[PDB]
């Protein structure tokens, strides 16, 4: 079992950098016509599921509080989040931003998956919720 | 049907930032050891994988031109990897072998009382995502 774990371990590591590797490829041309860089974009990726304060986003994100702070008040100076610990979120072109962000990935993702099947997706999709489930679980102890 | 691969999509997004989040939480204190930040271990994680040079290492890291040079001489200086032809040294090794035992723990705690073959299909239908990706980023 040893070299079990390890190898899902080596292959989920895999298997994440080249989503990553995919996505800032599939979304270079329409940060570049944003304006944004890769790391901002992945900021208004978070604050399209839930409203943040720079707080919360550096807990998730990692070392950089003042890097959070940067990045949040170039985000407010190009009008893409806004305010209403501070109300972080998405501004209407924001909005607009992930709304062409959903479209871009939707669409390769729809056609790389055109032959699955929902029944067994959907078996797949409950074992992963659970893991989710304990590592944020596992994240909140320690 | 839109909106069900836009939900998994999401899904996954959220699953693998939960993921990044708990692996650099797990971590702070074992690069803190070595005297690494997060950002040269992800240096040393590419290097456990293959030797690579700095061509490679900016590539798949992405926008990183020069940022990606001084880390690397961080690291060299460190002895953690060895020199072009860019490798990791037993230091360097050690590194990871005790990176992945504490992952490993881990892991295996959340997912003992898994049936294999459930763990399994998922490791088919990743690996088939998996293989789809590597076809297509190939493309362009």
């Known amino acids: 079992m040893v070299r079990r774990i390890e190898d899902h371990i080596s292959f989920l590591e895999k298997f994440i950098n080249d989503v990553n590797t995919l996505t800032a490829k599939l979304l270079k041309d329409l940060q570049t016509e944003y304006g944004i860089?890769?790391?901002?974009?992945?900021?208004?990726?978070?604050?399209?599921?839930e409203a943040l304060t720079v707080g919360q986003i550096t807990e998730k994100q990692g070392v950089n509080k003042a890097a959070v702070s940067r990045r949040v008040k170039k985000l407010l100076n190009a009008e893409l989040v806004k305010l209403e610990?501070?109300?972080?979120?998405?501004?209407?072109?924001?909005k607009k931003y992930i709304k062409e962000r959903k479209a871009i990935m939707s669409h390769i993702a729809s056609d790389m998956t055109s032959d699955f099947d929902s029944k067994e997706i959907e078996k797949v999709r409950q074992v992963l919720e659970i893991i989710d489930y304990r590592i944020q679980s596992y994240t909140s102890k320690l």
């Open 85 to 94: 610990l501070k109300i972080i979120k998405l501004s209407n072109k924001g």
């Open 37 to 49: 860089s890769a790391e901002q974009s992945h900021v208004l990726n978070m604050l399209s599921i």
